[PDB]
């Protein structure tokens, strides 16, 4: 890209980070509904 | 208006003794017995004599504008009859854009010559639109309603005051 195009677009815009199963929290409390086994 | 068919060709208009020749020779050396390009040359020469300060200088911007205007008129005359000629439609549109560019440069550099060219060639200089966006149906209807609503608001305010 040329300098004009870089100026027009501006600094790179990193997408916001994805929140995981814990929603960005160390731990979560939960109530067990059912127990089973998976393969 | 076109030059009369009796007028002599540009290349046979200054030959000494051209007025002392037979009527048949005059016809053979006139625009009547030639193609359209010689008539266009005569038109360009007439415009140059009428407009530019130095008609011999074909190198000036005004001379180029005159030549391109003659060409544009020729393309328009062609397209009046040849309505499905897409190539010549493209040539006409490009020529009009190029003439606009030259007129813009002339206006920026020499305003007096710009005025003289605009008057002589019957050209109405127009400023380009600021934004290029589609005028779709929704926008057109909405703009019409907004103009109307402003009008009744003005009427109501005049009645109030």
């Amino acid at each position: 890209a040329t300098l004009n195009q870089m100026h027009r677009l501006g600094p790179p815009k990193r997408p916001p980070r994805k929140l995981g199963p814990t929603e960005g929290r160390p731990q979560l409390k939960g109530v067990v509904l059912c127990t089973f086994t998976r393969k | 208006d076109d030059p009369p068919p009796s007028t002599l060709l540009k290349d046979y208009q200054n030959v000494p003794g051209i007025e002392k020749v037979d009527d048949v020779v005059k016809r053979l050396l006139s625009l009547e017995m030639a193609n359209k390009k010689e008539m266009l040359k005569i038109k360009q020469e007439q415009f140059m004599k009428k407009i530019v300060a130095n008609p011999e200088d074909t190198r000036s911007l005004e001379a180029r504008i005159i030549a391109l205007s003659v060409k544009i008129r020729s393309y328009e005359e062609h397209l009046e009859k040849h309505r499905k000629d897409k190539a010549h439609k493209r040539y006409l549109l490009m020529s009009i854009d190029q003439r606009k560019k030259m007129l813009k440069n002339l206006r920026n550099t020499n305003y007096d010559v710009f005025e003289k060219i605009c008057w002589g060639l019957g050209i109405e200089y127009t400023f380009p639109p600021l934004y290029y966006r589609r005028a779709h149906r929704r926008f057109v209807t909405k703009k019409a309603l907004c103009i109307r609503v402003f009008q009744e608001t003005q009427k109501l305010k005049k009645r109030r005051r």
């Binding site: - | 290349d11 046979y12 200054n14 030959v15 000494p16 003794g17």
Partner: protein
């Protein structure tokens, strides 16, 4: 005084410009004379062939 000195420098450069323009005018006059001689010869020949 700084503005006065600037104006004096402008006038000095103007005089240098006048000298340069006079030199260029003389040289261009001679070149135009030669080119017009060639043009006159060409016009004569072309008019003769038309006649």
């Amino acid at each position: 005084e700084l503005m006065a000195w600037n104006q004096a420098e402008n006038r000095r450069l103007h005089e240098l410009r006048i000298a340069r323009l006079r030199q260029e005018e003389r040289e261009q006059e001679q070149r135009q004379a030669l080119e017009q001689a060639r043009k006159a010869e060409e016009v004569q020949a072309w008019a003769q062939r038309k006649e």
